[PDB]
Amino acid sequence: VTAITKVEREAVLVCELPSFDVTDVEFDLFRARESTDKPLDVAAAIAYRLLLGSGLPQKFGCSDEVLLNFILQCRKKYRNVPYHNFYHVVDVCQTIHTFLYRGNVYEKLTELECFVLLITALVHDLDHMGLNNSFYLKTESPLGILSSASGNTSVLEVHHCNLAVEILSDPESDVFDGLEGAERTLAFRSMIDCVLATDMAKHGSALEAFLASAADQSSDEAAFHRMTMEIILKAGDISNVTKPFDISRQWAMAVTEEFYRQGDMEKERGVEVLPMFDRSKNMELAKGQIGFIDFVAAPFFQKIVDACLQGMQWTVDRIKSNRAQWERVLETR
Numbered sequence: 001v002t003a004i005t006k007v008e009r010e011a012v013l014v015c016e017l018p019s020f021d022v023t024d025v026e027f028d029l030f031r032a033r034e035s036t037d038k039p040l041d042v043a044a045a046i047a048y049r050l051l052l053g054s055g056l057p058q059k060f061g062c063s064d065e066v067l068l069n070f071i072l073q074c075r076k077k078y079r080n081v082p083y084h085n086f087y088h089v090v091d092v093c094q095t096i097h098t099f100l101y102r103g104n105v106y107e108k109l110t111e112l113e114c115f116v117l118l119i120t121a122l123v124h125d126l127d128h129m130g131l132n133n134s135f136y137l138k139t140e141s142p143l144g145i146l147s148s149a150s151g152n153t154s155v156l157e158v159h160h161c162n163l164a165v166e167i168l169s170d171p172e173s174d175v176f177d178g179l180e181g182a183e184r185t186l187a188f189r190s191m192i193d194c195v196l197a198t199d200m201a202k203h204g205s206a207l208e209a210f211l212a213s214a215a216d217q218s219s220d221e222a223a224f225h226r227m228t229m230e231i232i233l234k235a236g237d238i239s240n241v242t243k244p245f246d247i248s249r250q251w252a253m254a255v256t257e258e259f260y261r262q263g264d265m266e267k268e269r270g271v272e273v274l275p276m277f278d279r280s281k282n283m284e285l286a287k288g289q290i291g292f293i294d295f296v297a298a299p300f301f302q303k304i305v306d307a308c309l310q311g312m313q314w315t316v317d318r319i320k321s322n323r324a325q326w327e328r329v330l331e332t333r
């Protein structure tokens with residue numbers, strides 16, 4: 001990958017972020033973007049700041065300069081789509097920071113594991129084009145065909161891991177370079193395992209496996225740590241409904257537009273479009289959000305909080321608050 005110029009780093013290093021506490025659960029990335037004309041640089045400074053304030057990169061021999069190089073190499077590989085862009089993964093990074101440090105999930109993991117999660121947040125959607133796995137498979141696209149031939153349904157998640165490995169193979173962006181032996185191996189394996197676990201087709205089984213490990217005092221310890229990392233990355237990924245309503249809404253708008261574009265490309269290729277992806281049916285945002293809350297997010301968050309992540313209670317409270325606020329949009333429509 002072409003290296004990161006002295007210019008690009010300074011461009012990020014000057015953003016001062018007046019008014020913002022990046023470690024806060026009520027932090028607003030939409031307002032951060034809008035507060036300058038160089039949103040990409042602001043996003044990179046949020047990432048950078050979050051990583052330094054954690055104290056983690058320094059402990060694992062990752063200099064300030066290598067960190068920032070990695071962040072900018074990730075940025076370069078995110079596309080200009082509505083939802084799955086660099087803002088999404090900075091969001092996931094920031095959110096996982098809050099689950100670790102304000103939800104006390106750090107108590108369940110080593111420092112190395114916390115560092116790997118924060119890093120993995122930034123790689124976990126590399127080069128997303130705004131189309132899901134399903135699009136690639138049922139259009140018999142080249143990546144679809146390659147995944148089907150190699151016995152793998154997680155079309156995109158495999159692609160994300162490949163690009164992550166490229167970035168890390170350059171020592172000037174290898175945030176794991178200061179590791180050795182089993183620690184370096186664990187960083188790679190856990191990064192890759194987490195990214196593979198974000199495939200939503202695996203949602204139920206990854207959740208069941210996490211809960212089964214947590215309920216069991218004789219669970220293998222390495223496996224529990226691993227499942228917890230996976231569950232946290234997944235939690236960060238479906239975390240939009242745990243945010244202040246206005247933030248949550250703006251996320252739901254961006255996702256909806258992305259799904260609609262896929263539905264338009266499906267239409268053009270003469271393949272099945274799902275209701276949700278269909279721009280014509282215009283199914284209301286609010287019922288969408290309530291449905292997502294009822295069938296996916298509330299059960300997920302309630303079950304992991306109950307099972308062992310007690311400090312993440314606020315997520316369940318904010319989901320309830322948001323559901324009730326969507327009902328008030330319905331009741332007064």
Ligand SMILES: COc1ccc(C2=NN(C(C)C)C(=O)C2(C)C)cc1OCCCCOc1ccc(-c2nnn[nH]2)cc1
Pocket residue numbers: 200237238240241248251252253255256276288289291292295296
């Ligand atoms: C901001 O709101 C959303 C954020 C993320 C998502 C996603 N859902 N999915 C699908 C595959 C489950 C994804 O891959 C991501 C993570 C992008 C959806 C969001 O809300 C959009 C609202 C559209 C309606 O959403 C649903 C989705 C699933 C169900 C359902 N019913 N039964 N089982 N699942 C209902 C509504």
Ligand SMILES: [Mg+2]
Pocket residue numbers: 124125198
């Ligand atoms: Mg993804």
Ligand SMILES: [Zn+2]
Pocket residue numbers: 088092124125237
């Ligand atoms: Zn994601």
